[PDB]
């Protein structure tokens, strides 16, 4: 399956959750007892990985929250044209479906490709939507 | 007391949620600043 359930108390920091059908990454967790007799409630503050928005929530601790599958994958650039990166996989597979980043990451990547470094791109998959998060340079195998 | 008003109740006298109320709110909810475009003292 694309996504799998988990418990709120089983969740912990720097893990992925589904909040309002968005892949989110937790920055804050806090548990407070509801009433003296009652079970504690979990307050979750998380950041969407793709959009960067802050989404929070409060559930029972025993409640089950949905968790996505996030895969980070490593590729080499071939060209940046029309806002669409062209990447090259190990064993020689090529994809052009990735859109170029639109922020300061995209600006730095564009300048780095213009001045000619060999750039290593990390793109993540979660719940059927695809994006690029970071780039490095290959220190060896020039 | 909370039976008597939306603002009632609590171990301290405080409103709880925001006091700016939607224009589409219903009778019994419109207690506060109805459809406020802005709040606060302007200088």
């Amino acid at each position: 399956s694309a996504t799998y359930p988990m418990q709120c108390s089983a969740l912990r920091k720097n893990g992925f959750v589904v909040i309002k059908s968005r892949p989110c990454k937790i920055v804050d967790m806090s548990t407070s007892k509801t009433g003296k007799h009652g079970h504690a409630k979990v307050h979750l503050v998380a950041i969407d990985i793709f959009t960067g928005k802050k989404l929070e929530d409060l559930s029972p601790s025993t409640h089950n929250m949905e968790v996505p599958v996030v895969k980070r994958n490593e590729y080499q650039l071939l060209d940046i044209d029309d806002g669409f990166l062209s990447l090259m996989n190990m064993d020689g597979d090529t994809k052009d479906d990735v859109k170029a980043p639109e922020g300061e990451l995209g600006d730095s990547l564009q300048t780095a490709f213009d001045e000619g470094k060999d750039l290593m791109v990390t793109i993540i998959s979660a719940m059927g939507e695809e994006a690029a998060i970071s780039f490095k340079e290959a220190a060896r195998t020039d | 007391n909370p039976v008597d008003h939306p603002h009632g109740g609590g171990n301290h006298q405080h409103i709880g949620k925001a006091s700016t109320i939607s224009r589409g709110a219903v009778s019994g909810q419109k207690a506060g600043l109805i459809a406020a475009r802005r709040t606060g003292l302007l200088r």
Binding site: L77, D79, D82, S86, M88, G92, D96, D97, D142 | -
Partner: protein
Amino acid sequence: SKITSSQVREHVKELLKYSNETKKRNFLETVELQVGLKNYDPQRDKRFSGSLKLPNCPRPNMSICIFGDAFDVDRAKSCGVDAMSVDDLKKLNKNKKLIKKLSKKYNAFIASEVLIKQVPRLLGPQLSKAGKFPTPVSHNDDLYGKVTDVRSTIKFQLKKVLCLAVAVGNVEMEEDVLVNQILMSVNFFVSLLKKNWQNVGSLVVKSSMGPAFRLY
């Protein structure tokens, strides 16, 4: 499938009738499929890309270059296919006019798994701009077999324009083979396409130096 085999058979019959008998051409004529897709946006929708290998080759004689290592070049001597080594690529020294000349020289490129990393570093991104990027080959596989495979490759990639075209095959092949290849290419195209058989704008079959014939 909206398109029917008997209609394909009919249209192939007048196509080969025009190409072979009435107006014969000295150069061998390739049969082309030209498609246009409908209610689709390149900017927002996912850019589909896919490839299929036809059983009988469309273009037997099209020029191919093999970037290759010592073993790949030694095998390429037996294959009879043009090759330049890693030392040759370093001798090119990233000069744009000569690599543009090479890109217009060779339609297809085959490269080794080892050297496919630094093919962009020695050659740059103008291969990706042209759309001719080298295909991986390994020591285990047969180079001439993969030359036949690449010569029989059919690739659909969206890009920016909402119309595509591929070469189904030659005029000179047999009628049932031409019908089967055009049918499997249309089926592959609609398999890649989302919301299949309804985002098909137009399908056109043609021969080289021939008029267009419209299949839906």
